[PDB]
Ligand binder design. Structure first.
Ligand SMILES: CCN(CCN(C)C)C(=O)CNCc1cc(C(N)=O)ccn1
Ligand SMILES: [Mn+2]
Ligand SMILES: [Mn+2]
Ligand SMILES: [Mn+2]
Ligand SMILES: [Zn+2]
Ligand SMILES: [Zn+2]
Length: 456
């Protein structure tokens, strides 16, 4: 056999009552769906957000993609309109199979994708569209304030919990009250697909959820691995493609690849599949590896998503980043402290969950400060870390974005290390160093206490 399709991931068909609140729904399905990494959600049949777009006025520049298994691709890096892209895309698939596009079976495209990527003699290239929601490339969902009168049907979906523009700013999102420069994680991204255009194996930034909606067009085929098996997958991948695991100079140089799910399955990594059709959602859970390809010309929209369930995994993720020397998108501790400073307006369940994470943060910080004092760092000064651009507050050694504290030395102006890397700053003795801290321990306990009062 060439390709043995992985088993199907779970599919949910919520009632209107179940669907109305996405956070409740996603919490409810977690015990099932976290075991598979991905799941598919079919909205109720009358949930039909209208899509409108001028195919001649929307412009984008897609990336050329070689389709070679295990070959390195960079995670981010010729102008088309949506019309001219669609014409290219349709002609490509039509010519590839010598058939009309709807007649090409999904099973065949999948088999052929996996043949094509493993065959060295084949050098098939396609074009992959990825674009932030913006003035120049709008969301597929309705949004306010475009200097345009919206239809009543459009207005029905402005405030939907499953309008991907709203999910990050709803009260149950833990990023709802955050306002650091992290646009990539509260704003949707648009993906214009064609036959075989592919998303390599990856997990989301900070191990966040993702929500993915296929607005229209031909299906999107997915493979997913549960969070629990993330390190098994990485070990399998490292053995077969070690070049992908060399550390990156920055966060725009991440290496990813196409890899046959049968290889993962041969090494006892659990993998699930689905074909996502127009009008369906795919949800990826924290640290759930996923990859896939498009069956044909299509239009998808996705957003990162951080719930109360995610919060403690977010802390683990930043620890894992420190161990790997990987750059952070934002400071998790900064997020926690921001939320604490708004305790009175938080959702009560969010308040309760932030309180728990904050207690861990404070105890770890207490221990770290005791440790650096014993190393002979004596001098200290308060510092408003949040005011520094990220690249001015990264640990020299592990690249973590500092917030709670860091160590500086006047012999190396502007350099910082986190409290795990006091020995990596410079050759001067520790009495010349200064502990730079955002809060005293006595500042922190009342912040956590406000959260407790809000939580009731
Ligand atoms: C939430 C959107 N986002 C942030 C974008 N930035 C990293 C640039 C992602 O990474 C999503 N992960 C990539 C991806 C693509 C696709 C696709 N082309 O259908 C499906 C699943 N995952
Ligand atoms: Mn090939
Ligand atoms: Mn993704
Ligand atoms: Mn001062
Ligand atoms: Zn460090
Ligand atoms: Zn020094």
């Amino acid at each position: 056999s060439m390709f043995l399709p992985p088993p199907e991931c779970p599919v949910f068909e919520p009632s209107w009552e179940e669907f109305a609140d996405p956070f409740a729904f996603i919490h409810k399905i977690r015990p099932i769906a976290e075991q598979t990494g991905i799941c598919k959600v079919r909205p109720p049949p009358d949930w039909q957000p209208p899509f409108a777009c001028d195919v001649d006025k929307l412009h984008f520049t897609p990336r050329i993609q070689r389709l070679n298994e295990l070959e390195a691709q960079t995670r981010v890096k010729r102008d088309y309109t949506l019309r001219t892209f669609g014409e290219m895309a349709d002609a490509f698939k039509s010519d590839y199979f010598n058939m009309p596009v709807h007649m090409v079976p999904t099973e065949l495209v999948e088999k052929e994708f996996w043949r094509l990527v493993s065959t060295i003699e084949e050098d098939v290239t396609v074009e992959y569209g990825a674009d932030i929601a913006s003035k120049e490339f709008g969301s597929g969902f309705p949004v306010r304030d475009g200097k345009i009168k919206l239809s009543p049907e459009e207005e029905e979906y402005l405030d939907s919990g499953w309008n991907l523009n709203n999910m990050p700013v709803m009260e149950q999102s833990v990023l709802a009250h955050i306002t650091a420069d992290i646009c990539g994680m509260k704003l949707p991204w648009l993906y214009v697909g064609m036959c075989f255009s592919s998303f390599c194996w990856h997990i989301e930034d900070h191990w966040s959820y993702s929500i993915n909606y296929l607005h229209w067009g031909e299906p999107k085929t997915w493979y997913g691995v549960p969070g629990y098996a993330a390190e098994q997958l990485e070990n399998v991948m490292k053995k077969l493609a070690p070049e992908l695991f060399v550390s990156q100079p920055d966060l725009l140089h991440q290496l990813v690849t196409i890899m046959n799910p049968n290889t993962l399955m041969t090494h006892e990594v659990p993998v699930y599949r689905t074909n996502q059709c127009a009008g369906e959602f795919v949800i990826t859970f924290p640290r759930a590896y996923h990859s896939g390809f498009n069956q044909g010309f299509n239009f998808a929209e996705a957003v990162n998503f951080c719930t109360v369930d995610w919060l403690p995994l977010g802390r683990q993720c930043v620890e894992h980043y420190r161990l790997l020397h990987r750059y952070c998108v934002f400071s998790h501790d900064e997020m926690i402290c921001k939320m604490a400073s708004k305790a009175d307006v938080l959702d009560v369940v969010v308040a309760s969950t932030v309180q728990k994470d904050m207690a861990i943060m404070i105890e770890d910080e207490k221990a770290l400060r005791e440790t650096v004092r014993k190393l002979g760092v004596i001098d200290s000064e308060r510092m408003d870390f949040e005011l520094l651009p990220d690249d001015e507050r990264q640990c020299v050694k592990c690249k973590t974005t500092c917030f709670m504290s860091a160590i500086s030395c006047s012999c190396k102006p502007g350099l910082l290390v986190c409290l795990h890397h006091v020995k990596e700053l410079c050759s001067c003795p520790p009495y010349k160093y200064k502990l730079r801290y955002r809060y005293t321990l006595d500042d922190l306990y009342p912040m956590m206490n406000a959260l407790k009062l809000r939580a009731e």
